[PDB]
Design a binder for these strands. Structure first.
Lengths: 98, 103, 73, 83, 96, 95, 105, 97, 83
DNA sequence: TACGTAATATTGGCCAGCTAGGATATCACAATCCCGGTGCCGAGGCCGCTCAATTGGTCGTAGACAGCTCTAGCACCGCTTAAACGCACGTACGGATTCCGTACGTGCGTTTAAGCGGTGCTAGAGCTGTCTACGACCAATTGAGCGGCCTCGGCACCGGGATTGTGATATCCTAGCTGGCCAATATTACGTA
DNA sequence: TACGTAATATTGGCCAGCTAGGATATCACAATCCCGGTGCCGAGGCCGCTCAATTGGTCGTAGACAGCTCTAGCACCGCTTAAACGCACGTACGGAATCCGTACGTGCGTTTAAGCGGTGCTAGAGCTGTCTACGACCAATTGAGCGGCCTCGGCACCGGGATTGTGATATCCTAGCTGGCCAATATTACGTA
């Protein structure tokens, strides 16, 4: 066969996705999630396509940056693997969590 | 026009209009739009400068948003001015943490 | 169950490893092959410390009860 | 009726791609659901404000401007959509 | 029919030509520049607004824009900004 | 004869006497209270101003304050502030 | 009823609030309901905080709200804590909170 | 004669300083640091005494809350001891840097 | 002339008390100089803005209001000193 | 009959080569790369209309400036004492090391719904044009809110006596090791055939 | 002379006792705490003057409300992939476990300067009055900036070769173990004293 050591394709994918700018969540699942969340606020609502695009650009930027901070917390704990506690510490410090 | 008299490419008329229609204060002085339009033009040129540079480094003739993002996030001071801003379609800077590299 | 001294000697003979058995290797053999108490780990640690000083166990890795050892012969 | 079962449309490989762009090499198994909840709260906070803006404009269509205004409200200003 | 939306697109182009005559710009990138100018406009204007209120003044003059620029912009970016500002104001009043 | 410095002190003492008729308040505490009232005043007024501007309106009406309160306050605090505001407007309008 | 506060059933000054809204460059024109609503919201939040801070004061055996009582109040209420999340209350201290792992076993 | 174990007076001091609200930096050192930093911005400057109290209230509040985040970063790394690297992680995440 | 040698008036026991109110049990030896640098950066950023305001008011005395306005500028609003 | 000398058999000790564990250099395969061709759509330019900027003119008022007051920011000194400093000492913490199990990544093939281009159907966004209910602007009317003044009850501060938590020391229990006693096996000697 | 049996001695195993270590419980010591006493002064109330809010009238325009236009949001549809998914396999990473050295906590004696409160000095904050330069506002005017239209070169997409990096194998390097070789000791038999 052939097998790369664990972590090699992870690094290839880091280099790859830090090189590009296209969105990483599939557009229709995200759109349906947006409509679902919005219904619980006001029923019978329409969305401009650009409004969903704005929500997705913003959400993904938020998640990428949050994963940066999470990564720094993990490294702080001498670890290479991100864990929910790294996210929770990140958000705690960001002032989102209490 | 007030732009020529000030030597600006940016519209002093439009900026004076917006400052009045914007409920910033009762009255807007005659120098205010000129100064502001000039600051706006200056920062514009700073970002266009650095992002045309990015474009050329990337072998392009045309500025796309990634070039603006490269521009802003490689410049310390622009990076700080836009630190809570998100540049649609601009991506991130290539940066892998050291300990993740194979030894 | 035999004395901890006998259980350690049994764990080393029963593991034909190239480097005898470490404290962890011996420690898990005793837990599965004998009706041993809750204080197994301290009693193993104490027994290795005494068997090295006596020269019953001689060391192949580490320094002290934390390492890998073989029987003298 | 109660709405549910759409957040799982934010899949594991998608969260993985996001983590990669964030520079993450190794990802715990419990991260994926955690990232689903975080992303829900974020969208909630933003869409709520966006809808408050649509309501006030007496509209039935959420505009990109409503979203931009809400992001701005939340300290997450976004360029390129009508800023 | 047709509907009119103003933007700084033409002026961004004009300035792009000064700094990089042989390079162009996409629509998306153009929309970012537009966002940027509006945002920075709002930010200076808002600060200038507050400065006036703090000092019990009815007027936003260049001096408020100037201080606004110094609270807002970081160091080197402010220094240059104050220059271009004072410069253009001078040239303007000496062309009355 | 020192310059008149306006304050929300008198109102704050009123509310406090309705809600705790035997409780006092120190200088610093009242300064904080006064900064709270100014702060929230500025935040709501600001958001209303933005709402008007966003909708090309020249007027800040109780409807703008109301939406400002909904964007600005958290859940329950908003709910209660909205009903206590609509109540005041309804009165005011009839009397 | 001569005052606009009276006409509204408020303790907070609708007149002064209308003044500040005009002398504040918020919009060209300020509606007649705006100061009333705002003065009333201001009153509601005021009472909400005084409630909790008179309570703190009493827990502490005191007749007077000092700023620590306002801080105890704000930071123990989730929603007040959030409204004032980027705010610093002179002379108010912190909430007693020792981390678990720091406790002797 | 008598000696408390390490961590016992530390924990006693945590409870003590979390009970009070008084400033913890000595007032005159702080003031001299404020005048020095301001001097390097503009010479011959007077300070209202309350302006120095305001800078000290804010400064100490900032450091207290920063030590809170620093403490969590330390605990996150299975440690009990705060280190410069915990402060730096805190400030990075906060976006101060 | 150059001014120096004042930051050390923020002493080791003072930084320790602040750490205690922050819930810190054990403090590395290198934290003290690090906290001095942090506080200087903080004081620099705020006093810079305070003075900018003072300058604009054509005054020679920095007012509590100048500081309050500056704290607010940085997203560090302070209650109990005006405003 | 016993001891000594010489010879043969079994056991004891140390050393060498071979085997296992390691690192460096070289070889092969795969992935990110790059280059010249090809079509495709939006950058960018001109075009002509129109609405927002400009110019030229009136009126009133914001604030620049000058003059005067008196607040409070500053300096400086001596005295008390609590806090800061620095040094001695040792506990418990951080970090270095080993080590074991599975939770991860990698790479197959099978399963799926995202994506696209398609036509069709209309809610509702968004622009105009009417007009009146609402808010700006105003003078004249006046009573809520301000500072000035005053005083006493709340609380900061202190000294005396109390409750809870933590640490240290002592006692008790359990395990381990050593010594003694008993039992079994082997060897030798004596007696009988 | 040989064989068998009995007795004695030695060695090994098991049991019991004593000592040492670890854990748990109790007591003591210190810290925070809880208590009235006591004295200083700022919260809070009374007053009376003033300035900002109320009152009633004009007058103009924002926006609500209606009527029409058509943009973009939306719905079901059916192929063509590439992305999602589920699984096999195994390694490197996380975490648990232990061990050592010293950094950081605690306490003490000595050293340093903060704080206090009391005094003496003027810079400059902040408030008044005068007068005018500057900006709001309106009516008229004009070209800068807009959308609509068009077209073409910058760049996305792709197929066909090139370079670099990662993973694996083969060559050279050290330490450890078992076996081999050499020598010693112990037992035997004969000859001599």
């Amino acid at each position: 066969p052939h097998r790369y050591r664990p972590g090699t394709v992870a690094l290839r994918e880091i280099r790859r996705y830090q090189k590009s700018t296209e969105l990483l969540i599939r557009k229709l699942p995200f759109q349906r999630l947006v409509r679902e969340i919005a219904q619980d606020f006001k029923t019978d609502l329409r969305f401009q396509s650009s409004a969903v695009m704005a929500l997705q650009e913003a959400s993904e930027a938020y998640l990428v940056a949050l994963f940066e901070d999470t990564n720094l917390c993990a490294i702080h704990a001498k670890r290479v693997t991100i864990m929910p506690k790294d996210i929770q510490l990140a958000r705690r410090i960001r002032g989102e969590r209490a | 026009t007030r732009s020529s008299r000030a030597g600006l490419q940016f519209p002093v008329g439009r900026v004076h209009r917006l400052l009045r229609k914007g409920n910033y204060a009762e009255r807007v002085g005659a120098g205010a739009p000129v100064y502001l339009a000039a600051v706006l033009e200056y920062l514009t040129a700073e970002i266009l400068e650095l992002a045309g540079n990015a474009a050329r480094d990337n072998k392009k003739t045309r500025i796309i948003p990634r070039h603006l993002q490269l521009a802003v996030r490689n410049d310390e001071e622009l990076n700080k001015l836009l630190g809570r801003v998100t540049i649609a379609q601009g991506g991130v800077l290539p940066n892998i943490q050291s300990v993740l590299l194979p030894k | 169950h035999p004395k901890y001294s006998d259980m350690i000697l049994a764990a080393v003979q029963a593991e034909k490893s190239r480097s005898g058995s470490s404290r962890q290797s011996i420690q898990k053999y005793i837990k599965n092959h004998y009706k041993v108490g809750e204080n197994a780990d301290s009693q193993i640690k104490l027994s290795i410390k005494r068997l090295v000083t006596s020269g019953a166990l001689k060391q192949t890795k580490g320094v002290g009860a934390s390492g890998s050892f073989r029987l003298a012969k | 009726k109660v709405l549910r079962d759409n957040i799982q449309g934010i899949t594991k490989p998608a969260i993985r791609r996001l983590a990669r762009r964030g520079g993450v090499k190794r990802i715990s198994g419990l991260i994926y659901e955690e990232t689903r909840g975080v992303l829900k709260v974020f969208l909630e906070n933003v869409i709520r404000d966006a809808v408050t803006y649509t309501e006030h404009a007496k509209r039935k269509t959420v505009t990109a401007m409503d979203v931009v205004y809400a992001l701005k409200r939340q300290g997450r200003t976004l360029y390129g959509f009508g800023g | 029919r047709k509907t009119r939306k103003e933007s700084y697109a033409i002026y961004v182009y004009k300035v792009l030509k000064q700094v990089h005559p042989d390079t162009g710009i996409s629509s998306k990138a153009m929309s970012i520049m537009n966002s940027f100018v509006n945002d920075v406009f709002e930010r200076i204007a808002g600060e200038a607004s507050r400065l006036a209120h703090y000092n019990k003044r009815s007027t936003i003059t260049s001096r408020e824009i100037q201080t606004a620029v110094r609270l807002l912009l970081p160091g080197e970016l402010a220094k240059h900004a104050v220059s271009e500002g004072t410069k253009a104001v001078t040239k303007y009043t000496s062309a009355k």
